[PDB]
Ligand binder design. Sequence first.
Ligand SMILES: C[C@@H](CON=C1c2ccccc2-c2ccccc21)C(=O)O
Ligand SMILES: C[C@@H](CON=C1c2ccccc2-c2ccccc21)C(=O)O
Lengths: 116, 116, 116, 116
Amino acid sequence: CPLMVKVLDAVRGSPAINVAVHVFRKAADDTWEPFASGKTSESGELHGLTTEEEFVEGIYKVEIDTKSYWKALGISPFHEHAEVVFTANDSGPRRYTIAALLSPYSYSTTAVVTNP
Amino acid sequence: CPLMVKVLDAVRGSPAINVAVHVFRKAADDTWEPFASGKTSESGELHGLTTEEEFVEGIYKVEIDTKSYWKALGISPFHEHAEVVFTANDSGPRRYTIAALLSPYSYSTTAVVTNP
Amino acid sequence: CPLMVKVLDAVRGSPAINVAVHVFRKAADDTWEPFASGKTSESGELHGLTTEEEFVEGIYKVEIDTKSYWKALGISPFHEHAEVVFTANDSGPRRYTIAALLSPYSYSTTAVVTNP
Amino acid sequence: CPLMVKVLDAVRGSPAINVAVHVFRKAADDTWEPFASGKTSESGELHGLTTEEEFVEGIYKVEIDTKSYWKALGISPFHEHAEVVFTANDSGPRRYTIAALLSPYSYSTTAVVTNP
Ligand SMILES: C[C@@H](CON=C1c2ccccc2-c2ccccc21)C(=O)O
Ligand SMILES: C[C@@H](CON=C1c2ccccc2-c2ccccc21)C(=O)O
């Protein structure tokens, strides 16, 4: 599993559950092509987005649908999404964990990158 | 006046100076239209992006060009840029300050929405 | 002038107003001696804590009383307070701005060290 | 395991390994008594600090020795430590994960609290 997304709620001190996540990959014509998507689990994590084989070098965007998450909790947040844009595997395969920490008017995102 | 961007460097404990910032507005066909841009000052701030007249309700994206900032410092970064996407709302406070705190493998962004 | 504290609320996207802040200096017997204190202003800032003359090299602690802030808002918090401990250094820039970004179950703190 | 500490390096996008961690518990006379200590593993995590039985209600302080971590990497950071102070188990036993994200002039800390 070369790509994992983990989402935390800084208001409740909990995983952010059932958060929609969309991954895109930049095409040769510089447009964003759909790559993978899913929803975070009870642990706030989304596994199984891609495989080593599919996850080639490129520029990827992970869009985390934070607005819908907050609205379902009765909160009107500032951001539409949290977006994480990065070049992947440009020095060979790596394992990426994209973590996002959410508040209604602020988010943090951190990448933990390991060499298999 | 209605939109300010402030950028800080968490590695050096300093304003992030000479960071390119691009603002876009979402068009009717869901594309991103260039709206305003500039570079952060010696205080890490970018003022004068827009006017009350022009900054109407709609969806905006602020891209902060973090990769070029870290590359200039000789520090290997993760993200292509930091991306802040939000809906401007006339019902709320009149000033939007988008603050970004930068590290090579992590960034946070906070919206401070106030009435001058 | 040499020490400022700025506090922001990540839930409301606002300055954190009326937050108690206590500054201590480490004594020779390793105890914490009260040094200065105040409450954040309507801009979330606390100025005038100390003077260049008094702010000599040594170890300082800034405690930000976050629990009482969240309790006033009716929001259940995790931390008793946010605590920032550092050594003041004459070799470096002359102004220390301690910034704290607050959520109920998370806080960050950043030092911006500059020359006015 | 009711208490876990996890530490990440925001400069390298990696676990923070071999970081010293000291836990204290406030005594009846309002002094900080040593409670547990250890060092983070290769995964940046510290497990086994305490047991359900020992980890009674109280006010706890987790001190993470971040300065020594950065200095060993050749960096002179701002903070002496990252300190996390919280009341634990005051509504019955909980499981606490204390996470800290480190940069030379900034740190974040987040608590994830679960009901067993
Ligand atoms: C000018 C803005 C504040 O900008 N937001 C900041 C801000 C936001 C997130 C993390 C740190 C900071 C910070 C540090 C020093 C000075 C300002 C800020 C306001 O007061 O509304
Ligand atoms: C990528 C990380 C996964 O955990 N990352 C966390 C993580 C990352 C950024 C901010 C907070 C957290 C956090 C809080 C509680 C438990 C875990 C985390 C790893 O295992 O190395």
